[PDB]
């Protein structure tokens, strides 16, 4: 029923603009409120502005923060909400949420829409395995992974076999080489007895690079 | 104008207790004509903040009882009797009556549970990876309790310093444990100059510290 979901984030230019879209659908678009919030990496929420329903004229408010410097609209005969930013600065680099208010508070958000300010230029990364090392020491259970190395800017998306592998899964939050360049590893644990019968493929996905790889780890 | 402060900012509860939070607003937040809107939000390990209390103590749609709101004027608790695996994740208050609207700062809250010890797992660096020019050598503590633990390498014996970073992932809501990797780096030269490459963990539920080696390179 209810769908919000953003987009229109990715890398930009210290001093540049990008302009972020929320898409609804499932509700009278025009009865609510419309906010915006970002999140960066690891910090708290930071409440950004809105733009009020129709019955109120459609009127914005702003976070002291942003305000002048971001701007709120929405396009009500198809329901999108939007977000203007000028000028941005690293510190804005940060996770965009979309969310409605009303008789409910911010009952619905987004799924978010990531963005980075950065002059450094875009690098999909290079996937490698982290094979189960043959003679898998004292172990009925095996690890394997895969390495995603050398990429920017965030995130990265790693899943197994399509979604289907799911159990003993852990992806690493990503850190910075030296390079300046991310980097993480994604894992994932089961029998050593299968190391013959099954199939583990690690499904990278980039985006700001177009890049996708599936990888087949092996022992 | 308004200031949102939370307390406390990190919060260990026992599986089964009763957790308390507070925010204390900078000035009533009682929305001139009708009452009071002040929200708690959650948000669990990679996924979007969700609500749970609107007005006050109003229970959103399928949220359980055991959460409750309560307080008034500058003064607002958020109470969760008999904590779980899943109510893990950080927690925030909103003020949604006086314009600019504003967030707490933020309370995480962890899980404690029974000492459980990392397993050891230690991969080499990919061939794929060695036709570049560099090795990646991966030590991983897999699944262990609580969050601190230590990891030393030793390339034949020797120890190493600062040619290496760690990353731990957040607790699991499954069985509230960590994981953490660490991932020694090296020069494809430097590799083929060594022989013995080790991975040594430390950790509270070890009596006896565990090693992970190859001979390769
Ligand atoms: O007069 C009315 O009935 C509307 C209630 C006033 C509150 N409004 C809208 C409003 C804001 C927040 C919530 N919430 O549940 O969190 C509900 C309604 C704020 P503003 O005047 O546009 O800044």
């Known amino acids: 029923q209810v769908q919000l979901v953003e987009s229109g984030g990715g890398l930009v230019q210290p001093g540049g603009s990008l302009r972020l879209s929320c898409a609804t659908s499932g509700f009278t678009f025009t009865d609510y409120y419309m906010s915006w919030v970002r999140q960066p990496p690891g910090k708290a929420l930071e409440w950004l502005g809105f733009?009020?329903?129709?019955?109120?004229?459609?009127?914005?408010e702003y976070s002291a923060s942003v305000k002048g410097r971001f701007t709120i609209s929405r396009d009500n005969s198809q329901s999108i909400l939007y977000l203007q930013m000028n000028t941005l600065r690293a510190e804005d680099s940060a996770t965009y949420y979309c969310?409605?208010?009303?008789?409910?508070?911010?009952?619905?958000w987004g799924q978010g829409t990531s963005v980075t300010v950065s002059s450094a230029s875009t690098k999909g990364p290079s996937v490698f395995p982290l094979a189960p090392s043959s003679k898998s020491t004292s172990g009925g259970t095996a690890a394997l992974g895969c390495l995603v190395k050398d990429y920017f800017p965030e995130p990265v998306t790693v899943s197994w076999n399509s979604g289907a592998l799911t159990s003993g899964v852990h992806t690493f939050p990503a850190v910075l080489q030296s390079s300046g360049l991310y980097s993480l590893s994604s894992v994932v644990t089961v029998p050593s007895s299968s190391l013959g019968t099954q199939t583990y493929i690690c499904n990278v996905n980039h985006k700001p690079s177009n890049t996708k790889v599936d990888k087949k780890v092996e022992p | 104008e308004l200031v949102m402060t939370q307390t406390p900012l990190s919060l260990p509860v026992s599986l089964g207790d009763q957790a308390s939070i507070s925010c204390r607003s900078s000035?009533?937040?009682?929305?001139?004509?009708?009452?009071?809107?002040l929200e708690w939000y959650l948000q669990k390990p990679g996924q979007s903040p969700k609500l749970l209390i609107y007005?006050?103590?109003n229970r959103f749609s399928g949220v359980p009882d055991r959460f409750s709101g309560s307080g008034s004027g500058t003064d607002f608790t958020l109470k969760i009797s008999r904590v779980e695996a899943e109510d893990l994740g950080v927690y925030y208050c909103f003020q949604g009556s006086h314009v600019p609207r504003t967030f707490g700062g933020g309370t995480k809250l962890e899980i404690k549970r029974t000492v459980a010890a990392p397993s050891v797992f230690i991969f080499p660096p990919s061939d794929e990876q060695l036709k570049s020019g560099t090795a990646s050598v991966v030590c991983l503590l897999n699944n262990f309790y609580p969050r601190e633990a230590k990891v030393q390498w030793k390339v034949d014996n020797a120890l190493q310093s600062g040619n290496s970073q760690e990353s731990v992932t957040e607790q699991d809501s499954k069985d509230s444990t960590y994981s953490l990797s660490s991932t020694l780096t090296l020069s494809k030269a430097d590799y083929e100059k060594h022989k013995v490459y080790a991975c040594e963990v430390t950790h509270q539920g070890l009596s006896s510290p565990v090693t992970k080696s190859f001979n390769r390179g």
């Open positions: 000035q009533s937040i009682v929305h001139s004509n009708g009452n009071t809107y």
């Open positions: 007005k006050v103590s």
């Open positions: 733009i009020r329903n129709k019955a109120n004229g459609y009127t914005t």
């Open positions: 969310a409605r208010d009303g008789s409910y508070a911010m009952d619905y």
